[PDB]
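Risk register update: the risk of archive-format incompatibility is retired. Evidence:
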Amino acid sequence: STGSATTTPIDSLDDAYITPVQIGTPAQTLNLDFDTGSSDLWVFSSETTASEVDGQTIYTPSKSTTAKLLSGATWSISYGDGSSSSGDVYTDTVSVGGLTVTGQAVESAKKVSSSFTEDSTIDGLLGLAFSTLNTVSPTQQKTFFDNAKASLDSPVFTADLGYHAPGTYNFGFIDTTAYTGSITYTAVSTKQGFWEWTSTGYAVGSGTFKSTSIDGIADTGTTLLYLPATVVSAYWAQVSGAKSSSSVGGYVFPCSATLPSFTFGVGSARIVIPGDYIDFGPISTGSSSCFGGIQSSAGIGINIFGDVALKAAFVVFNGATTPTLGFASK
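Archived output:
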């Protein structure tokens, strides 16, 4: 089997992407944030504290003839941005882009943090990291991909995120029309439960490539590119007037600037992030100070190849017995 679904930016800055997902019988369609940096599929629901729901579409398990309470199971998750959610668990039928999994754990939110409430466009998350990170207790549950894997034509999914435009998540096949040149594959460590890999270096604009190993995660659920402070300083030094602002919470730059590109290495291959992808717009409405798309990972504890990086590539998440990651230009 295979599946193919379009993913759409939530706003004009590509702060996140949503993908429609069918849950239950009859289908209830929710728009979920596909997140290769976590491993829980959770949704706003009829059980979510009413004051914490503001415009989201909810899953109502009592209206699904295939929903079953997973008795005694609870979940609770905290994300890198400080947001969180928790609740109980149902199993139900879940379909993405024509690919169906029966008996998928659907984690129903009883509580969500303010950041979730305030984002009306995101109805929940669909985690695509390794199932070892799944938070369901006392019986850990598998991701949608893990459940689908054996049925797929090939044990892979791909992320093809758009810049200020829709893109695609495919399951079970590689669309050879979706990228240019060849796909370069690179080793993955699953030790921390992430799609963790090592970039071979970077360049700033038309500058020379610096060969240096950068360990990080491919994370579709993180907006920006978070890299070591040395790398980030080298980037922003090429932008007149750019500076790190503790009050704003990262590097800002004059909105009048033209940003240089940023290149990262994948083995001997190179992925070029155009300068415009690094512009996250005014820090507040009407400001001439703009927020940067490349930020320091210092004090995160890990480097994160988030959407800023991934949307410059066609990315293969290869879930074979020994997982790997592939990157192509597009």
